[PDB]
């Protein structure tokens, strides 16, 4: 629907006022059919729109919702280094060991993208640095050579 399209666009842009006008019990968990089925919460999380993330969560957005590739909004936040968003999602019950269709977890994303504080947050909440994705790679395996601090963090040493 045009309304849902406008809502998804508003979530992506961080347009709080438009989100408030279009967010209904029926649209809060709508999906971008013409993309990868991101929900408003995926868009707000991935584009670091904190106020929108907050509003959506308050109004019943599903923190556990998977997109077409099996990503939850915590994946989006972690891949793009959005620490506050990640913390809000975890506080609202997001599963940290969640795995997409390729068995990538949020820790795989944070590690690969060089996000130390987010890795630390995930580990504090029980994220498993030993979980292999479908390629057989752990999050540690995906750490860039230059990020020796992240390597040490995930090694527990």
């Amino acid at each position: 629907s045009e309304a849902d399209r406008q809502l998804l666009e508003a979530a992506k842009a961080g347009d709080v006022e438009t989100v408030k006008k279009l967010c209904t019990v029926q649209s809060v968990n709508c999906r971008d059919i013409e993309g990868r089925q991101s929900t408003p919460l995926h868009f707000a999380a991935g584009y670091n729109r904190v106020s929108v993330v907050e509003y959506l969560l308050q109004h019943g957005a599903d923190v556990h919702a998977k997109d077409k590739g099996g990503l939850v909004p915590l994946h989006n936040a972690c891949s793009y280094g959005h620490y506050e968003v990640a913390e809000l999602l975890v506080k609202h019950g997001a599963v940290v060991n969640v795995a997409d269709l390729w068995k990538f977890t949020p820790l795989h994303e944070a590690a690969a993208k060089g996000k130390y504080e987010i890795c630390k947050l995930l580990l504090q909440h029980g994220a498993d640095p030993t979980k292999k994705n479908r390629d057989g790679n752990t999050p540690l395996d995906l750490v860039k050579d230059g990020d020796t601090d992240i390597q040490d963090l995930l090694r527990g040493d």
Binding site: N48, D67, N76, A77, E109
Partner: peptide, 13 residues
Amino acid sequence: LQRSPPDGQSFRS
């Protein structure tokens, strides 16, 4: 099948 990235980006700018 390509694993495409999540919707989003790291820098708002």
